[PDB]
Amino acid sequence: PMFIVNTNVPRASVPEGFLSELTQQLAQATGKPAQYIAVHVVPDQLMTFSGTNDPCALCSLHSIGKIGGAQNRNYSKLLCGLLSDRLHISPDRVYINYYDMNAANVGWNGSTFA
Amino acid sequence: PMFIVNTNVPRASVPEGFLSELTQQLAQATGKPAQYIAVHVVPDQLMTFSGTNDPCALCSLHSIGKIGGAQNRNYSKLLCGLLSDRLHISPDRVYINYYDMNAANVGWNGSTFA
Amino acid sequence: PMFIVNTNVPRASVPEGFLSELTQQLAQATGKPAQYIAVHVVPDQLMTFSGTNDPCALCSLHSIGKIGGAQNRNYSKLLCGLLSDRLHISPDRVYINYYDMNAANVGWNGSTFA
């Protein structure tokens, strides 16, 4: 899976460890091995949410499978809780787009996974 | 809805107010209130279009519903018009990918819209 | 078509000429003009793969058609080979998500392709 976070919080506010904690927390939550988790954090972005420029985040989680109604609620609880606790971004200024990717549409290692 | 613009136009060429103009022009054309609209603008990118590095932009609009061929041509004329009057990017060097998100695949506020 | 690469390799490590190369190699592999190809490379990113900060990349290829089993396998050989020879990223630390876009969902020149 891959998790991307874009945020107007500044770089010096993302705590050491934050990527490694999202890696291990996502491997538990998705049940995928940690070796296939990628995390990407992009601070200091020019963003607005609900018309204001208070701290906010736009995120994406792509996974082959493990995407659905209850699971994505669970991911939002986990990921909005870490973005509030670690980055101090209120949950109601976070969006997370979830994508259930087909294996034939994810390249890795020179081939795809179908 | 969430609108993202990535462009090779430099930061200082992106005028103040441009994220509020896209917020209020999206809430009028999508019909969704500004509370739900997030906008993210990323200047100074390394990007080419048709092979050349004149001004260009790659953008995405994600929304739960309100996405279709004729709606998307309305959004394309309004957003290409703001990118050409504000950022002076030619409309034929702009791509906008539109995504109709299922509510269960959008997280917000620690849960999801399903 | 549009190809985006996000990677933690530094900007000075990207060959000057790498976007032109990717334009021309994605016009020979998708079979599409280089006028409608857009390429975007984002170095120096905060990202991890398998929980370590060794060189990695998260990419996307979007195209109207030309996207499917065989073609995605071919693009994964071509583009994993390019990022390993040019940016020295190991193919097992690259993800490429492939998106077959409906023509009605791609805006360009103030309209959509359908």
Curated annotation (Swiss-Prot), chains A, B, C:
Recorded family membership: Belongs to the MIF family.
Oligomer status and interactors: Homotrimer. Interacts with CD74 and CXCR2 extracellular domain and COPS5. Interacts with the USO1 and BNIPL.
Compartments reported by the entry: Secreted; Cytoplasm
Catalytic reaction equation(s): 3-phenylpyruvate = enol-phenylpyruvate; L-dopachrome = 5,6-dihydroxyindole-2-carboxylate
Principal location class: secreted
Effect of P1G: Loss of tautomerase activity, reduced activation of intracellular signaling pathways, and reduced interaction with CXCR2 and COPS5
Enzyme class: isomerase
Pfam families: MIF (PF01187)
Designated name of the protein: Macrophage migration inhibitory factor
Originating gene: Mif
Gene Ontology process terms (BP): cell surface receptor signaling pathway; cellular senescence; DNA damage response, signal transduction by p53 class mediator; inflammatory response; innate immune response; negative regulation of apoptotic process; negative regulation of cellular senescence; negative regulation of DNA damage response, signal transduction by p53 class mediator
GO CC annotations, alphabetized: cell surface; cytosol; extracellular space; myelin sheath; nucleoplasm; plasma membrane
Keyword terms of this UniProt record: Acetylation, Cytokine, Cytoplasm, Immunity, Inflammatory response, Innate immunity, Isomerase, Secreted
Positions of post-translational N6-succinyllysine modification: K77
Binding site for substrate: K32, I64, N97
Entry EC number(s): 5.3.2.1, 5.3.3.12
GO molecular function: chemoattractant activity; cytokine activity; cytokine receptor binding; dopachrome isomerase activity; identical protein binding; phenylpyruvate tautomerase activity; protease binding
Free-text function comment from the UniProt entry: Pro-inflammatory cytokine involved in the innate immune response to bacterial pathogens. The expression of MIF at sites of inflammation suggests a role as mediator in regulating the function of macrophages in host defense. Counteracts the anti-inflammatory activity of glucocorticoids. Has phenylpyruvate tautomerase and dopachrome tautomerase activity (in vitro), but the physiological substrate is not known. It is not clear whether the tautomerase activity has any physiological relevance, and whether it is important for cytokine activity.
Active site as annotated: P1
Modified residues (N6-acetyllysine): K77
Classification lineage: Eukaryota, Metazoa, Chordata, Craniata, Vertebrata
Provenance organism: Mus musculus (Mouse)
